[PDB]
């Protein structure tokens, strides 16, 4: 696909839970990682989402938070993907951070320049990408 | 309204589906286009949303993806608005892209500078704005 | 926590409404302000959210809209926090705006540079931060 989102992950539906107006879709990524997404029930049905369906998960860079220390907090954001900072491209007030994940999957996040300083992000650094389930778009081939 | 969101569209509710905690609102835009939004049920009731109600849909620029080629994928994002690139304002790491839609409605998206290069966006270029239903705020006059 | 989100608010759950796949959580902030969040029901249960639980609400800067005049519109976005512009850091195409709220809580928003001009934001200026309920992550200690 030619889409602006910097994150386009391939995977397979491992389970679906249909709600009233939304549906929760659990996805197993190409390399061990798991994601959850909430999409409208009309999309889950239109896309024919079911266990075993191959899909792509699409996440824009400004929808990914970065965390270097949870400090014992447990978050509601269902998607926590841990890796190492690969590249940092700094702009004026924002910076594009790409992390390398387990298996070689990369994830890019757009965060303020002040976050980069405060978390100590630099190539090599451990960090986790955090993505709320409602910020994941799914796609079917 | 004096609000930072760059996209404020006028329209009318064409249908409402009330869920348990959320509600799906389908909107017909001023010129042919359609949108779907998911808002809390408490807001749908507080705003008195019903078929025929005039409303505004509010979308911040960083919530709009741009796509130039779906490559046969079908996305869950309910809102796909196709047009032509009007203006590009490039910053350091991000760029503000405005598209002109059918009827003359404009939509602005904030994407990384690398997306602009990779999709070949430039004034005149065909592209679609993609917005997940959960990233639309609605307003009533 | 060491997390990129610029907004991390402490508060207590004042009520919870469980849906089919999502749950709505109403939170009373440390100083008078209130927030609503929509998270998956699986998270609400995993985090053991109930009335009186102390939590943190996490919101990234690009998820906060700024409004200086509603012009009589009522929005669906459940979280409207009013204060005064404290600092503005301008980048190339975006600018980071921090507002000081009632009690001394600060909230930072990332908006286009054109929004800053158009709303007349500058230190001292009245403005409200607007955050859709689905853009709030919750955390438990
Ligand atoms: O659509 Mo982007 O380039 O991930 O902000
Ligand atoms: O279906 Mo519920 O959000
Ligand atoms: O349960 Mo979440 O905070 O919507 O990923
Ligand atoms: O509130 Mo904005 O200027 O669409 O990012
Ligand atoms: O059905 Mo969606 O929530 O527009 O991806
Ligand atoms: O993760 Mo942010 O974009 O620095 O609030
Ligand atoms: O009811 Mo909302 O989801 O804060 O627009
Ligand atoms: O200006 Mo940069 O994001």
Key descriptive features of the protein:
OB fold (Dihydrolipoamide Acetyltransferase, E2P), 141 residues, binding protein, mainly beta, five-stranded antiparallel beta sheet, trimeric, 2 domains, 2 helices, homotrimer, molybdate homeostasis, 12 strands, binds molybdate ion, 56% strand
Please state the overall shape of chain A, judged from the principal axes of the Cα atoms: elongated
CATH fold group of the largest domain in chain A? OB fold (Dihydrolipoamide Acetyltransferase, E2P)
Number of helices of chain A: 2
Q: What is the CATH H-level superfamily of the largest domain in chain A?
A: RNA polymerase II/Efflux pump adaptor protein, barrel-sandwich hybrid domain
**Beta-strand fraction estimate of chain A:** over 45%
List SSEs of chain A in N-to-C order. EEEEHEEEEEEHEE
Quaternary structure type: homotrimer
Largest sheet of chain A: 5 strands, antiparallel
CATH architectural arrangement of the largest domain in chain A: Beta Barrel
Spatial strand sequence of the major β-sheet of chain A: 4-3-2-5-12
Largest interface: A-B, 40 and 41 residues
Number of strand elements of chain A: 12
Give the helix level of chain A as a range of percent: under 10%
What structural category do the secondary elements of chain A indicate? Answer: mainly beta
Question: How would you characterize this protein structure?
Answer:
Chains A, B, C: It holds the Pfam family TOBE. The structure is a homotrimer of 141-residue chains. Chain A folds into 2 domains: 70 residues, RNA polymerase II/Efflux pump adaptor protein, barrel-sandwich hybrid domain (OB fold (Dihydrolipoamide Acetyltransferase, E2P), Beta Barrel), CATH 2.40.50; 71 residues, RNA polymerase II/Efflux pump adaptor protein, barrel-sandwich hybrid domain (OB fold (Dihydrolipoamide Acetyltransferase, E2P), Beta Barrel), CATH 2.40.50. Chain A is mainly beta and 141 residues long. Chain A is elongated. Chain A has a 5-stranded antiparallel sheet with strand order 4-3-2-5-12. Chain A has a 5-stranded antiparallel sheet with strand order 6-11-8-9-10. Chain A has 2 helices and 12 strands. Chains in contact: A-B, A-C, B-C. Strand 12 of chain A pairs antiparallel with strand 7 of chain B. One molybdate ion sits at the interface of chains A and B.
């Amino acid at each position: 696909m030619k889409i602006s989102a910097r994150n386009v992950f391939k995977g397979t539906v491992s389970a679906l839970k249909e709600g009233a107006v939304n549906a929760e879709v659990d996805i197993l990524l190409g390399g061990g990682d798991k994601l959850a997404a909430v999409v409208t029930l009309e999309s889950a049905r239109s896309l024919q989402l079911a266990a075993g369906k191959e899909v792509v998960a699409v996440v824009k860079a400004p929808w990914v938070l970065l965390m270097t220390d949870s400090s014992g907090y447990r978050l509601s954001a269902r998607n926590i993907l841990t890796g190492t900072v690969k590249t940092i491209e700094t702009g004026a007030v924002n910076a594009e951070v790409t992390l390398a994940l387990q298996g070689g999957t990369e994830i890019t996040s757009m965060v303020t320049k002040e976050a980069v300083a405060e978390l100590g992000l630099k190539p090599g650094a451990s960090a986790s990408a955090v993505i709320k389930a409602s910020n994941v778009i799914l796609g079917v081939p």
